[PDB]
Amino acid sequence: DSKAPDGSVEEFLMAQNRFAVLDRSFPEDAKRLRAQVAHELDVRFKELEHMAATNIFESFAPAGGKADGSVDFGEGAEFCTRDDTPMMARPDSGEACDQNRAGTSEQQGDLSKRTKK
Amino acid sequence: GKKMMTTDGNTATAHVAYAMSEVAAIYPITPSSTMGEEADDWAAQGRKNIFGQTLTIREMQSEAGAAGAVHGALAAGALTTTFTASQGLLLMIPNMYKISGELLPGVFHVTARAIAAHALSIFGDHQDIYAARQTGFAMLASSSVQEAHDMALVAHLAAIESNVPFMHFFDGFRTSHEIQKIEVLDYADMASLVNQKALAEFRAKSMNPEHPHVRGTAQNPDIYFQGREAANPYYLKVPGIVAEYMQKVASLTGRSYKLFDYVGAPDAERVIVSMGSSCETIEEVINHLAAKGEKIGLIKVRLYRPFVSEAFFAALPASAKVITVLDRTKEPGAPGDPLYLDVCSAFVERGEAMPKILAGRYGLGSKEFSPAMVKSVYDNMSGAKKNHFTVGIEDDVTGTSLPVDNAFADTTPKGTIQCQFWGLGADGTVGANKQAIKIIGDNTDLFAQGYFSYDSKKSGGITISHLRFGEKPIQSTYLVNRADYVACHNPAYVGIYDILEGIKDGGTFVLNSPWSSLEDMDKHLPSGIKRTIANKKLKFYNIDAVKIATDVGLGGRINMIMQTAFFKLAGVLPFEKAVDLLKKSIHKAYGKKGEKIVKMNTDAVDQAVTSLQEFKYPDSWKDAPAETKAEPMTNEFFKNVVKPILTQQGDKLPVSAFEADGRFPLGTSQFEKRGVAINVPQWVPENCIQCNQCAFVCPHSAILPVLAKEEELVGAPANFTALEAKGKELKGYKFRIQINTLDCMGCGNCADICPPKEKALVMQPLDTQRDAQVPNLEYAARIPVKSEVLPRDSLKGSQFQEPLMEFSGACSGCGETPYVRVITQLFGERMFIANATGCSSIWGASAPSMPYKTNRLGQGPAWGNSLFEDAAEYGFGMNMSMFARRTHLADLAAKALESDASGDVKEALQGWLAGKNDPIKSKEYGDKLKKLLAGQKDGLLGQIAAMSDLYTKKSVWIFGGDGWAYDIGYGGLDHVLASGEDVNVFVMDTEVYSNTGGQSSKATPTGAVAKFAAAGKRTGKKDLARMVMTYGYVYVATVSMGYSKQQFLKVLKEAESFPGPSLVIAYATCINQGLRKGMGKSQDVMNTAVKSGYWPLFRYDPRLAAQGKNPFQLDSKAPDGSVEEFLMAQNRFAVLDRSFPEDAKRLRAQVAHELDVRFKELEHMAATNIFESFAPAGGKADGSVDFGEGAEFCTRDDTPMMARPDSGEACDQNRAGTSEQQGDLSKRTKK
Amino acid sequence: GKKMMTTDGNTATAHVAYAMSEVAAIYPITPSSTMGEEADDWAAQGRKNIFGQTLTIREMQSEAGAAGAVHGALAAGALTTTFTASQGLLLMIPNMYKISGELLPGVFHVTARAIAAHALSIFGDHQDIYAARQTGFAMLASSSVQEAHDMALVAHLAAIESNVPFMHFFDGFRTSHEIQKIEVLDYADMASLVNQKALAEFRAKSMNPEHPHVRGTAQNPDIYFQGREAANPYY
Amino acid sequence: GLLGQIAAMSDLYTKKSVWIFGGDGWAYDIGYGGLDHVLASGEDVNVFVMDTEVYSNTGGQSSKATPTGAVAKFAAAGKRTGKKDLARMVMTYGYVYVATVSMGYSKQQFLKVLKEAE
Amino acid sequence: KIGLIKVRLYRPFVSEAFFAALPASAKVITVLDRTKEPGAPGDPLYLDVCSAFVERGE
Ligand SMILES: Cc1ncc(C[n+]2csc(CCOP(=O)(O)OP(=O)(O)O)c2C)c(NO)n1
Ligand SMILES: Cc1ncc(C[n+]2csc(CCOP(=O)(O)OP(=O)(O)O)c2C)c(NO)n1
C-alpha cells in the first residue's frame, strides 16, 4: 500500500532523540547504524515488492468438514503405537502388539521363510 | 439415576467435568492428560453436557495459555474447566489470583503431582496443589476413585453458587490411575442440583458490550487494600455452600461427607490428620487395629481451603491426647508443612487443651504409604513421639525417619483376593487385566481394584500388575505385598527379579515357560524359588503359553492363555461361571473377523484349562543348593546404586546414597546390557563394502565398527573375522563390523539400509548370536577407536569416533537417537546440552540409566534438563556463563602478556587469545598452557592455571522436540535465536507431542490424526523455519538422515561453526506415527519424506549474504509424486482414510498442494538476488547514554512507573503545542 | 572503606548486586526496574565487579525466560543475580524450585509488590514473596534503605557459602524508592568477605564437558523421596 | 419454555467483535507465544498492536520491536540487532489476515484495514 | 511496656532465634502480615509463629 523509500530516512531518524543522542555521543557508530537502517528497509521493501508480484500463493479453505466422529491414531496399526511408559498409559491401553523388537515385516517374513521347519 | 462403572480417578472426574462445563481450555501433562483426552473423545462421539451441548474444547500452547483462556471464557459468561498438574499448575498460578480475584465460578481438576527440584517426577504428591494454596481458590480433596467423582460434582456446584473458583484434586497415579468399581450419577441428576438463580446471575454479570463494565483496573494505595477485602463475604459463605452440596449429593447417592470427617474409636487417644488417598489405607488399618482394642482414629480433610477450624474441631475426639498431621509435601526451611501449620493455628486459636501435635511427611513422588507405615505413625504417638519425621524412607543422614516393620500383618478385609502379574511390555498382560476387572465387576457383587506399575524403559519394559477383588470395599491404596496369586508372564524374569516376594503360604504361582520337564525346570528355575515354592507349599503351575498359542494358531501371543490361567486358578470365581464368562467375552470382543479368529481364542482357552495342571515338585527343593555368582565386573556406583534400582530395590536405598543436588554420573547404561531384542543383525563379511552406514543409522549405538592393525588382533577370538580395510588411507588396517547383540533392540534399520543387494547384514534370533558375539563385542570394545585416521565429519570417518550417547531407553528404531548420537561424535567432548523435557529428556536421563557417556579422556556432554518450557533460555544462560568466565580468562591472559611471564607462556597466551573462539586453536594453545602452567598456584599464572576447563571453545546446544519448539518454548526459542549469540538449537521433529501420548502440536501436519486432532488436524503445519529465517542473521537448516547422511553432517558442521544463532530441524520418525512396515523402515521413510516433497531440505547461511552470495540454498529435488504412498504408509494418515474416506482424500490432497506451493516458494528464494548484508558485530566501545538526554520535550511521564533516581527535571511536556506553534504564538503576542 | 551516599533502596542494593555477580538475566517490572537499568548503565560504563570484570547483562523475553537463563548461568558456574517483583516473580517460581533443588548460589533481589487479583497494583506488599515461600529459597528481609545495602551483601555472601539460593527483598516503593543518606561499602571490602574455597568448589562442580555429569534426571517412586531429603544438611 | 430461554439470551443475538489490544512488548516478546498460537487457531478474533518500538509504560526498555541503532534501556549504545519482523512471520501461515498501518500517512488505508481485518 | 521483634531471615524460620528475641514478660503478641491468603486460617508469618509456640509447649 505504500511506495519505495523516498530517501528521507536520515532526517526521519535524526529528528528523534532516540537516534540523535547516539549521534551526539558516538558519532562513528551512529552513522554506521543509521546507514544500516537505510540498508535494512531497502532490502525489506524490495522483498515486499517481490511478494506483490509473485504468482505463487497458497489456496485457502475457511473451514468445513470434521463432523461427528473421531479416531485414535493407534487404531488398526500394524506395530505398537505407544511405549511401555506410565506417561502413555491410558484407560484403554494394554493390548498386545508388535513392539518393533523383531525387525521389519519383510525381515520377519524372510526370517520365517529361512527357518520354516 | 445411578449406574455402576469401573474406571479410574481421571475418567471418574472427567465424567462430571464434561457434564458441568460449556468450555475447556486444555494442555496435556502427565498424569492429568487422560481427562482432556476423554473429554475430546466424548465431544466427538456426540456426548451432551447438562445444557444438551457438546463441550467446546481447545488445546492451548501451554498451561499459562490455557489458564488465560479459562479466565477469558469465565469473564465472558461460560462455565469452564481445565485439567492439570505439577509444572502445569504452577503456570496457571498468575491467572488463578485473577480468577478468584474476579469471583469467577471456574473449576480446575488436578492430579496432584510432584514438582521438579533436585529431579523431575511425574508421580503423586501435594507439592503442586500446596503451591497454589494462596491464590484464593477453594481446595477440595478426594481420597479415592469414588470420591473423585463425588467431589468433582460438589466442586462445580459450589463454584456456581459461591462465585469462588475451586480446585478439585486427587493424588497423581495413586488415585488418578487406580481403577475401581464405583457408582456415577446421570447428567440429569447433576443438572437438577444446579442453583439456577446463581447461574443466571453469573451470565448477567458477565462481559458483554450490550451491558459492559471494565474489569482489571490498576489501583493506587488509596483503594487497593479495600478492594482486596471486599470479597470477604463470599469466602465466609463457601464452606456452608460446600457442606450443603455434599448433603444434596448425598441425598442422591447415599454417600455423605463433611468438611472434615472422622473415622475410628470415639475415645481415640492417638489421632492422624491426613488428606488424599492415604486416608483410605489409614482407615483400613484403623479397622484392623481398633478391633484389637487400640484407641486410634483419623480425621479426613475434605475442604482444605477455606480452612474452617470449627468443622475441624467438630471431628476431633475430646480424648485425643496426641495427634499427628501428615503432609504429602516438603517446604524447605519452613517451620512445618502446610496442613500441620493450619492445624497448629486451630489449637492456639482455640486456646484450651493443647494435645501435643506432631508433623510427619510421607509419599513424595508416589512413594508407598503402606499399612506398616501407618502402624509406624501410630506407634510413634505412643512411643518416642519423634516430630517432623519422614516415613517411607531410611533417613540415615539426618535421622528424621521412623523405622518400619514389614512383618506387620495383612490388613485387607476378610475375603479379599490379591493378585500380582509380571509382564513384558506389549505382551498384553495389562490389557487382559483391565478386561478381567470389567468381566468380574460387571458380573459379580465383588468390588474390584487395579493398579499398574510400568517401566522407564519404553521397549521391552517390565509391567507389574496389582489386582484386588473382595466382598468388602477396597481401601488398599498401596501395592499388593502378600499375594494369593502370582503370575510371571516372562520366563526371563524368573532369575532376575524377586517374583515370589511376600507370596502367601498355599498361594498359587503360575509361570510361563517351556520348562515342562522336571529336568528343564530344575535347570532354569533358580534355587531360591524352588526353596520358596517348597517351604510355602505353593501351588506351582507351568504352562508353555508360547507353544499353546502357536498350536491353536494364535501365533505365539500368550495373553489369552495367561488370561485363562487367571480365571481358572485365581480363586475369585468358581470354574463354571469363570470359564463360561471368559468365553462369552471372547465373542463380545473380537468377533471382528468372522468366527475364525474367535475359534482360535475359544480353542486357546479350552486347551489352556486342560494343560493347566499343578506342576509337582520334589520335597528336595526345600533345600536345593544355593548357586554361585557369575556376576560381571562393573562400577561400584553401578554395583551399589543403579543395579539395586534396576532390580526394583530402589526403595531400600537410604538417603545417604544420593547426591544432595540430584546429580548422576555419566555412562551408567554401559552395564545394563538388557538383551531384549527378539532378532539382531548378523554381519556377513563376504558382502560388506565397508561403508559404515549401519553404525551411523543405529538408534542405540549397537553397531561398533572396528579398524585394527594386525597387532591388535593377536588374542582375538577365532571367529573375529576381519576384512582387509578398503581405502588408500586405511592400508594396513583390518576392518570389522561388530554387533552388540545385548544392546541391540532389533529394529532392523541397519539391515534394511545396508547397501549391497546381497545384504552384509541379516536378521537372526538373539539366541543364535549372543554366545559368539558377546565375547566378541567384549573384545572389540578393548580395541582403540581410530579417530585420527579419517575426517571426523565425513560419513565413514564419524563412525570411527567414540559415540557419547549409547544404549538409551528409547523405543526400538527411535528416529531421534540416531541424530544426537552422531552429533556427539562431532562435538561431544566440548558440548553443553540444555534438554527440553520430552522424549529426549526421558531416554536421555531417566534415573538410573544415563546413556550419555565420556570419551577415553573423561570428556563428554555436560547434560541438563531444566523445564519443558525453558530449554532455549537455559542454554542461553550456559552461554552467558561461558561468555563471562572466558572473557575473564582472556582479561587475565592479556594482563599476563604484560608481565615477566616466560617467552613460551606468553607465546601460548597470545596464541590462545587469537584463537579463543576457534575449536581447533583454542584447544591447541590451551593444551600448551595446561602443560606450561602445570602446578602453578600464585598470582596471574595461578588464576589462569585454575581455568583450564575453560581453555577450549565450548559448543552450547539446546535439544528439544517439536512440541517444545513450536508451542510451549517457542517464545523462548524465538528470543534466544534473536539475541544473535552463539548457541545451537537442534529440534527433533516428530510432528507430535510424543512423550506424553501423541497429542497434536503446531508442528503436526494437515490431515494427520493425533490427540485433539482426531478427525485429522485442520490447520497446516506451522512453518518455524521460514519464520526464523526472517531475521536474516540466524543460520537455519532442515535435515533428514534417511535422505542424506552427508547433508546432515554438512549442516552440523555449518550450524555449529556459525558464530551466531543456529536452528536445525530434523525429521524424526516415531512409533506414534504408526509406520505400517515397522520402525525398521525409518531411514527409508525419512528418505521418502524428502523425495516426495513433504520434507524439503535446505540451508540458510548468513555468511554467504555477508559475501555477496545468496544465503538460501536448496538441497533436495522437486516433489517426485510419491506423497500419497508416503502418507498412506503411516497409520496417523491411514486411520482417517479407513474411518472418513471423503475427508481423508481431501486432507491428503491439500497436503499435496501445500508441499507443492511451498517447494515453489523455496525455489524462488534460492533464485533471488535480493538479500540483506551480514555483520557478526562491529562497534561497541565503552560508554552508555540514556534515551532522554538532550531531548527537547519531556521523554518520560508523570507516572510512578517511569520515575528513576535521576528524573524530576523540568521539561516541556507537550501541553503548549508544537515548537512552531509555540513560536508562531510567541510572535503573535509580542508585547 | 566506607562511603556516605544518598540513594534509594533500589540503587543501594544494585550497588552490592553488581559487585557480587558475574552474570545477570533480567526483565523489567515496576518497581524493581531501576536495579537492572542501573546495572546495565554501570557495565556499559565499564564498572568492575569484585572480579575486575564488567557485568554480563542480557534482557530476556519475560521473567520466566530470565529465570531459565539464571538457572543455566548458575548451572554453568557463574555467580548470577536478577531483579524482580509481583507477576514477574510468579513466572520465576518453576525455575526457583530447580535453582534451590540443585543447590545453586543464586540471588534474587525483589521489590515486594502486590499481586494482581481483583485489580492490578504496582505498589508494595508481601503477596509476591509469600507466594514463593515453598520454593526452597532462603528469604532475607531488609526494612530500610540502609538495610537493603547490608542484607543484599549478606545474601550474596551466604548463598555462595551455603549453596542455597537467596531472595533478598524489601518493600516496593516504601523502601525501593525512598531515598536516604546511608553508608555503603567499597567493592574491595565486599570481595574480602567472600569464601574463596566455597566459590572455587561451586566452579568445579559446575557443568563443563571437561568433567561432565547429568542434572535434572526424571525419577521414579523408588528414589525420588530420598533425593528430596538429601539436601537437609545444607538447609 | 424455549421462547423464554431464547428471550433471556438477547445479549447474544448480534454478532460480537472480539479484539485483543497490546503494545509491541506484549506482541513481539512476552505474549508472542500466545499470540502466535491464537493466530494459528484459525478462529475469528482481531488483534491490534500499537507499536511504540519500546516498552513504554515501564520506562523505555528495548523490545524486539526496537529498531537497529535506537537508544533504549538495555540498548544504551543503540540496539545492535534489527527489528523482529512479526508481520512477515505470521504471514507464513497463509490463513491469517495481516496488515500494517500509519494514521499520518493515510487515514483512508487505516479505515480500509479495520473493515477488512474485522 | 511494649516491644518489637523484627524478622530478618524469614526462611529458613529458626524458632530458637525467634525465642531468643522474645521477652519472657510478653503476655500478648500480635503478628503483622503484609498480605492476604483468602480462606487460610491465617497469613504466613502468623502461622509460622503459632507453630513456634506449640512446639515449644510451654
Ligand atoms: C509447564 C509444563 N507443561 C506440560 C508438560 C508436559 N509435557 C512434557 S514433555 C511434553 C511433550 C513434548 O513434545 P515434544 O517437544 O514434541 O517432544 P517429543 O515428541 O517427546 O520428542 C508435554 C506435553 C511439562 N513437563 O515438564 N511442563
Ligand atoms: C509477568 C510480567 N508482568 C508485568 C511486567 C511489567 N510490564 C508491564 S507493561 C510492560 C511494557 C509494555 O510494553 P508494550 O507491550 O510495548 O506496551 P506500551 O509500550 O506501554 O504501549 C512491562 C515490562 C513484566 N506487568 O502485568 N512481567
Ligand code: SF4
Ligand atoms: S537392528 Fe536396530 S538396534 Fe539393532 S543394530 Fe540394527 S539399527 Fe541398531
Ligand code: SF4
Ligand atoms: S551397512 Fe552393510 S556394507 Fe555398510 S559397513 Fe554396514 S554391514 Fe558393511
Ligand code: SF4
Ligand atoms: S520419539 Fe517416539 S520412537 Fe523415539 S522414544 Fe519417543 S515415543 Fe519412542
Ligand SMILES: [Ca+2]
Ligand atoms: Ca552456532
Ligand SMILES: [Mg+2]
Ligand atoms: Mg515431538
Ligand SMILES: [Mg+2]
Ligand atoms: Mg510499546
